[PDB]
Each structure stands twice: as structure tokens, then as C-alpha cells.
């Protein structure tokens, strides 16, 4: 029931790789510091989102077995998860404990960042649904890896190969859940339940960037490739 030695090695390795990410405080200190125009915020979004993809590619290449997968399946997994991984990381940063009234301010800042009204509620409803589960850093790290190695994506040719890589991560995560929350025997299942709501953010990701309240929507070549914009 307790993490095996193989599971403890897997977990610590996923944690190290996950830890190579931009410090949350860097992101929130800036948003809180002062109010920016919808234009300055659109630019902050594109630079953060370009850096997020670059780090995600490095995190993914380190996942045990990912490099043994067919090359075309490797691109399909990365392309299929990149936007979901971005919102999951945004949800993590959003629910990090801040000084009194700071998350209120962070929330007011994001609300008036330039994003369209139609996307506000679903986004904050998702970030809130995430904050309700009170996830640990190990849970965020494992859930990101599970999101990336989803064998039920589109354009995946060899699904059973992906399943084989995702299963040990699900098993470690399940054990952590049955420890971090013995009183919530539904914790593992709700974490998996959130993954379904996250897929809904895929439906309109391109439109979320396009409807931002700016006169022009300039993106980087890499973002154009990942999000489905030009």
C-alpha cells in the first residue's frame, strides 16, 4: 500500500523535472505589482505561454519511456496536452496561498486582463474546482504527467504503448491520494474528474486568445503551432 522503492524513485524523479519550472511568485508578484493594459497583458500571456511550452517539451522528454514512443505519437501527445497543461499550471499558481486579500486582487487582475467575458466564469469555475481538492505539489506534478501521457488523444496510432507509460503514474498518484486524504476516499477519482473538465478548455483555446481585447493578436511561431492560431 505504501509507495514501493520503484514508486518513490519515479515520484522524486517527476518532482525534480517538475521543479525546473518558472517560480509561481515570479508570475503573481508581477500581476499584483501593478495594473497593466489589455495590450501589456496580452504580451505577458504570449511570453509566459511560449516559455511554458518550451519547459513542457523538456518535462515530457524526461517522462520514463516517452522517447521510445513512435515520433509522430510523441508530437500528437505534446500537441494534444500543451494547452491543458498550461491551464493546470495556471490553476496551481492561482490556488497558491497568498497574503490577505492578494488572491482577491490576483483574481480581479486576471478578470480585467483583457480576456473575453464568455471565458471568465468557465476558467474561474475550473480554477475554483481545482482549489477545492487542495492538491499537493506531487499531485500537480503527477497529474501533469498523466495529462501528457493520455492514450485516448486524437491522432495517436499506438495507444497501448501510451497506456503502458501512463499506468505507473496513475498507480503512484492513487497511493498518494489514499494517504494525503484517507477521509476523502473519492480524492483520487475527483482528481481524475478534473482532467475531464480540463479537456473542455481545449474546445475554445484558439478563440480565448483571438477574442482578447486588443487591436491586434500577434503570436510567436511556436505558439501558432501549439495553440491553433496564426
Amino acid at each position: 500500500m505504501e509507495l514501493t522503492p520503484d514508486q518513490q524513485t519515479l515520484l522524486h524523479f517527476i518532482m525534480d523535472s517538475y521543479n525546473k519550472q518558472r517560480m509561481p511568485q515570479e508570475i503573481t508578484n508581477k500581476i499584483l505589482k501593478e495594473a497593466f493594459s489589455a495590450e501589456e497583458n496580452f504580451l505577458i500571456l504570449t511570453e509566459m505561454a511560449t516559455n511554458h511550452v518550451q519547459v513542457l517539451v523538456e518535462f515530457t522528454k524526461k517522462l520514463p519511456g516517452f522517447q521510445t514512443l513512435d515520433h509522430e505519437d510523441q508530437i500528437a501527445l505534446l500537441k494534444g496536452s500543451a494547452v491543458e497543461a498550461m491551464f493546470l499550471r495556471s490553476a496551481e499558481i492561482f490556488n497558491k496561498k497568498l497574503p490577505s486579500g492578494h488572491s482577491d486582487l490576483l483574481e480581479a487582475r486576471i478578470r480585467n486582463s483583457g480576456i473575453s467575458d464568455e471565458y471568465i466564469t468557465p476558467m474561474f469555475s475550473f480554477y475554483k474546482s481545482i482549489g477545492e481538492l487542495k492538491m499537493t505539489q506531487e499531485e500537480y506534478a503527477l497529474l501533469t504527467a498523466i495529462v501528457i501521457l493520455s492514450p485516448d488523444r486524437q491522432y495517436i496510432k499506438d495507444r497501448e504503448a501510451v497506456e503502458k507509460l501512463q499506468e505507473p503514474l496513475l498507480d503512484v498518484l492513487q497511493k498518494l491520494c489514499k494517504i494525503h486524504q484517507p477521509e476523502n476516499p473519492q480524492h483520487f477519482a475527483c482528481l481524475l474528474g478534473r482532467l475531464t473538465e480540463l479537456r473542455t478548455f481545449n474546445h475554445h483555446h484558439a478563440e480565448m486568445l483571438m477574442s482578447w481585447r486588443v487591436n491586434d493578436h500577434k503570436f510567436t511561431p511556436l505558439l501558432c503551432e501549439i495553440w491553433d492560431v496564426q
Binding site: 522528454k61 515520433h71 508530437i75 505534446l78 511561431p221 503551432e225
Partner: peptide, 13 residues
């Protein structure tokens, strides 16, 4: 091609 940059980041190193 279609995911030229993504293919590069994955195939470098």
C-alpha cells in the same frame, strides 16, 4: 512541416 518547431524541440539533444 506542420509542427516543424515542435518536431525540432523534440528531436534536438
Amino acid at each position: 512541416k506542420d509542427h516543424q518547431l515542435l518536431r525540432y524541440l523534440l528531436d534536438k539533444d
